[PDB]
Design a protein around this ligand. Sequence first.
Ligand code: CA
Ligand code: CA
Ligand code: CA
Ligand code: MG
Lengths: 268, 275
Amino acid sequence: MALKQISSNKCFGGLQKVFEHDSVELNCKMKFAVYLPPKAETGKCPALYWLSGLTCTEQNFISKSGYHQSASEHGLVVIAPDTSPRGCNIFGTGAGFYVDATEDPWKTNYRMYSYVTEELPQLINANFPVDPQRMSIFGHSMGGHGALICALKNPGKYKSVSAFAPICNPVLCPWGKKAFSGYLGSKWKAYDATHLVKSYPLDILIDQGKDDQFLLDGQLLPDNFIAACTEKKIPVVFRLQEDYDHSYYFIATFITDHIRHHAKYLNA
Amino acid sequence: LKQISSNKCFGGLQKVFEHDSVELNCKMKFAVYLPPKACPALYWLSGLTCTEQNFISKSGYHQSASEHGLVVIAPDTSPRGCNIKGEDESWDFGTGAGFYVDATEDPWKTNYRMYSYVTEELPQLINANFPVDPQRMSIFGHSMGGHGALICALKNPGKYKSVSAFAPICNPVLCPWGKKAFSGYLGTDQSKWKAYDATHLVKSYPGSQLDILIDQGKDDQFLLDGQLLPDNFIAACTEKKIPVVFRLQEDYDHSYYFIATFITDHIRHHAKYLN
Ligand SMILES: [Ca+2]
Ligand SMILES: [Ca+2]
Ligand SMILES: [Ca+2]
Ligand SMILES: [Mg+2]
């Protein structure tokens, strides 16, 4: 399906683009960013999807993360969708946590789980030089939660997963309780990484800043997820990074490690 | 769990249980056979119109399940007793017709989650309540349940040791049954549909080789009607180098008389990989 190009800027040899399309899942125009590395000039590339957190559009990650150099060198197409069909209504985040909403009025339009896992990859594969068989996913905060649950709910669909400061056990934290209450109204555990990993039938990298206010506030609960991984013998690398916070300055510091991680499992 | 029935059969016990399903938000019945050994688990998925009674009473599976020491679990085919508008009308949609998908469309979203029931909730419940090895599980089924078995294995690489089917719906995106079910449960976004189609799934399946066994009656009315489309799936396997034994059985139909004839072969097939 048909795309409208919003912008294009050369960066580390490849092209950072932004596109708009008519989303079937979301019932609206939706924007997403696509980075086409040098590899995409001549061949199909593996794809890496980035999910952003609160207050983000597609612009934050593409302009502030510094992911381009490593994506260019390894030859990964990087896709960064917007976080939601509509602006924020905001004492809660007001965000929908990448679920398929079951409560009205969110019901009708907030179908971010299906958008990320089904509609968007179909669109990318039809429109860009991407290998449909090799896809990985990562993200930050609410998007870290998003990446984990997309991977864990769809075994083998993603070659690898990673996250920066993910919300690991949303059913137990205030942000998750408030979001799930609004969007899902018991349905909740199907969207909780700590629950999902316990019955998972594989390579996970997580970075967490130790001076992250939201970690200190108990929103993230990484130890619950790591413990669930350890019991299941799922190989997880969890790095607690001293004095780092929740910001894109933290993300930028470790993004190359993440791109290298995904490049390995995407056979790039 | 509430025990509904228990009957001794080839040394083991054929039981039926009732429970409150979290995924389906209703009371559900399922059958469990505990062989004398009770074990690896084998899940049987039934087709359109079936309850948890059809396979256990008509397949004659017990002798082979007993001899090979397999726990066999046979769930129902849809949520029950929900009184949802539109679910009771037609035999090919709604009750007895869950299609082993997680529905995304109202009014099916809340109760029609047979995919998550079969792959997540049920195995969790079985593991917690029965002497089952959580690491050794296989799946098979008939028609809509053949579709179910195939997609459950293909969407979950590493989860099942083996898979087989009787007269499976192999390419549901293309057949009338699949088109109706998917339109109703999943809506018009066919990207969703392809994620529940064995022929599409096998092309992208990244897991270890599965040795798939399929029996098909040649005089099967639904084969003739084009509901099943096995050749599309066989070709898809061939290209992905997934080993598949496809057996076209002369003069056999779609019934449990056909299933009963070949059930021992299937149990032995799964036993090879489970034991
Ligand atoms: Ca902070
Ligand atoms: Ca055994
Ligand atoms: Ca269903
Ligand atoms: Mg989570």
